[model samples]
Target: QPVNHLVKEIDMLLKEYLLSGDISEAEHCLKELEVPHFHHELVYEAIVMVLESTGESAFKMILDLLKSLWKSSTITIDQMKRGYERIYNEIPDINLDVPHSYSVLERFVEECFQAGIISKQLRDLCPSR
Candidate 1:
């Protein structure tokens, strides 16, 4: 499966993230993995891989890329759902235990909410707030 190949590439990158808190490599990896309308889940997985350390820069990068995709009509709401699902379900499989990682994800989701990238009802962590 080509998606699985993408998964492995992200897995390798995840290891790199664990060993080194820098995600500059992740930025390069994203460029290597980028397609005209790439799967959002792949990028989300990359974001989750570096969530513990990448901070707002990576978050903004993903958000910028995400909005750019929507602007180009390359991604849809369903694609965002899959991206959300990737973080919720697939994080356990990434094989590294970074503490409070999803907390970082929550802030990303909040940015999405603020940017109108996603509605409050669809927000991942805190839907009511």
Candidate 2:
């Protein structure tokens, strides 16, 4: 099966298990969401947020547990906006006139570095140019 199809199948299975109150089955599938190739920081945070906020009646009971897990996660409240920006890739119009355009692109570069997604040291390769 194609990778995307596999992800979709796992997503559906996880949802069904959660809705059916089969917590163990759902937990087993949660690992699927973290597939090393596709799991971005934003996707992880969103699913974790949904898990923490699940089940209205059991919410209070789970709050402390969720808080501890959440606090340890690299996903910080201050970084959430940046995480969403990475998710949407909502780069500004390419005028380069804005003061923070460089900063925005810098962040994009940094994120690529963090994800093991970007490499190639520009100066080293282009030294003669």
Candidate 3:
């Protein structure tokens, strides 16, 4: 599926959040996009791609997506390992520290700013590819 679908989902979540002023619905939307633990790397990678993203609200929605990742799903480092094992049927070199992806994401945020994808004030580093 297109990653834009995730962007669309996040937009709906944010809009629903505004319309109903219900953070819970936002939470539910986030839960819906939850990847299996094994997909963490892909999730991280996708976020980075979104960091280099071309859209305005779409890239900003990356924050909402990350929030969903932490709050909605059972997706975790342990789950990442288990999911990888289930998918590849092998123990892999997954990182227990997911924060490492943050640096690259932050860089992309800067890139977006330099390219004017968003205003300088919007240099949020919650996504990268």
Candidate 4:
């Protein structure tokens, strides 16, 4: 499948996961994708979705999903790093759409660090405002 198609699938999965708030269901859906190599795309899309969303629910749901996926070894640290790096690299553009993206990204990085999904060094990669 093309990258655009993969991203679209991820976006749909994340949208459903956000409304349902069922981490296990989300995990199952991710597994169903059968494209472990592309899991980083899901991670990247989910983080960006949460960053652009307006409410606290989306943020919490995405964090919980990340923690669950990380704990289950469904997504690897290397994959997580790639996903987060993409977001970091696109922060300038993202910030244009979401004015609070800088602070939101900082908080998300801290949360990921606290959850042990990302290392301190990786957390430090988050761009400062």
Candidate 5:
């Protein structure tokens, strides 16, 4: 299965969203995927990209995008949680690229909890550094 192409599309969508700050355009791109079951990949990809980014601005953009998607019910809490889990699971590797990934992931989880995008259970379950 060559799912790599979809991953590339996810990256492109996130990059464009970061550049333009266009939430609707990003939503449209995601909707075009027509694979609601795979929406978790978008969530995973967005968070990973933000974590890997050089500055904090991308972090804000990603949080806002996730909030919008959650608010509009474009992605579900289950998918969001699953996406977050994927990040937590990959923290070891991510740390190699971004030294502060653990801290960043913690903050992201906290923000998601405060925004009501994720549950307290999930927030509390975030892996410790």
Candidate 6:
């Protein structure tokens, strides 16, 4: 399969399992994909897809994914926007609910914002109370 096809397939499978209420199946399926660790864009693609589906339900995973990208300096402005747009298009007023989760997201947004890889408009979409 092509890279895009694989990314979309992984995302589609994950989104399906997440909504299907069988989280272990979702977990198993995603682990089975064996996604390439070197491709940040592919990783980001999957992140956006999962966030679009589960939103706050997958908050921790989202944060961890973003953090790893940040640590590796692989995330970009367009990638950040894609993740935001994917989730925001579905939930314009996204709410992570948990104070810590929201804070974690905010700090990461601040980091991206400072690095100029994300815009104020995009940062404004960070989770809220």
Give the root-mean-square deviation of each candidate in angstroms. 5.8, 12.9, 12.0, 1.9, 1.6, 8.5
On residues 5-91, what C-alpha lDDT tens digit does candidate 4 reach at each position?
777788989998888777888899899988888877988999899889987888888999999998899998889889988899999
Sort by TM-score, top down from the best: 4, 5, 1, 6, 3, 2
At residue 20, candidate 3 shows an lDDT of 67
**Candidate 3, lDDT over the whole model:** 0.44
Query: Which digits, one per residue and each the tens of the lDDT, describe model 3 over residues 22-93?
Result: 556655655666745434544344344343445455354544444444445445655433322332221122
Indicate the worst ten consecutive residues by lDDT in candidate 1: 120-129
Give per-model TM-scores: 0.59, 0.30, 0.34, 0.93, 0.92, 0.39
Please write out the lDDT profile of model 6 over residues 1-129, one tens digit for every residue: 447676677567645744665545654555566643424444445444433443455544444445554455555546557765554453433333322434444554665566555578887876532
Candidate 1 local Cα displacement, residue 129, angstroms: 8.0
| Residue clash pairs of candidate 5 | none
lDDT for position 125 in model 1: 44
What lDDT does the true structure give each of the candidates? 0.60, 0.39, 0.44, 0.87, 0.87, 0.52
- List, residue by residue over 39-106, the lDDT tens digit for candidate 5: 88998899888788877898889999999999999997788888888888888899888898888988
Q: In every candidate, how many clashes are there?
A: 0, 0, 4, 0, 0, 0
C-alpha displacement of 111 in model 2, angstroms?
24
Residue 116's C-alpha lDDT in candidate 2?
A: 39
Runs with alpha carbons beyond 4 Å of true place in candidate 6: 1-4, 12-57, 92-120, 126-129
Please identify which of the two predictions, 2 or 3, would achieve the higher TM-score against the true structure: 3
Tens digit of per-residue lDDT, candidate 2, span 95-128: 1333444343444335433443223452112111
Model 1 regions lying over 4 Å from their true place: 1-38, 50-52, 91-96, 124-129
Query: Where is model 4 more than 4 Å wrong at Cα?
Result: 1-3
**Candidate 2 accuracy as lDDT:** 0.39
